[PDB]
């Protein structure tokens, strides 16, 4: 869960955005981003194949219908 | 006022109490077999060529019957 750090005692910061990076995220902001990330989220081809088999049977019924004339 | 920690090569983020690692492994093994995003392109071109040749069968059955 929570991290495990090398240096024991914390250090204050004074830097700028143009200097070194730092994670400074307020809690409701990260909560809302977790909500927004959570909320933002074949055999029919075999069905087509089997229906095409039925079309093949319909077609051979048509072939048996046509040759009798 | 702000308090932080200076980065190191010996600071380690642990596993998230193995209650989220298990759903990571679930998401690992529920997608080992599925959409490979490779035959989707083959699916598109096969569907399109199939539509093309079926419409060609329509033209053949419309003209060769006369």
């Amino acid at each position: 869960s929570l991290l495990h750090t090398f240096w024991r005692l914390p250090v204050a910061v004074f830097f700028e955005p143009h200097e070194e990076n730092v994670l400074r995220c307020p809690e409701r902001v990260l909560r809302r981003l977790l909500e927004d990330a959570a909320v933002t989220m074949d055999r029919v081809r075999k069905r087509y194949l089997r229906q095409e088999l039925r079309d093949l049977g319909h077609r051979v019924q048509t072939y048996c219908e046509d040759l009798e004339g | 006022v702000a308090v932080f920690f200076e980065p190191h090569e010996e600071n380690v983020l642990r596993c998230p109490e193995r209650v989220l690692r298990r759903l990571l492994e679930d998401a690992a093994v529920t997608m080992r077999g599925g959409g490979w995003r490779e035959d989707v392109l083959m699916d598109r071109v096969r569907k399109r060529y199939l539509r093309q040749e079926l419409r060609d069968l329509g033209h053949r059955v419309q003209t060769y019957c006369e």
Binding site: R45, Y48, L49, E52, L56, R59, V60, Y63, D66, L67, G69 | R46, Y49, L50, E53, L54, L57, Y64, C65
Partner: peptide, 20 residues
């Protein structure tokens, strides 16, 4: 003609089977 039409349809369905 008629047998030619029936044969070309069943053979073209047999080659339709080799897309899927």
């Amino acid at each position: 003609l008629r047998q030619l039409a029936q044969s070309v349809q069943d053979t073209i369905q047999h080659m339709r089977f080799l897309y899927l």
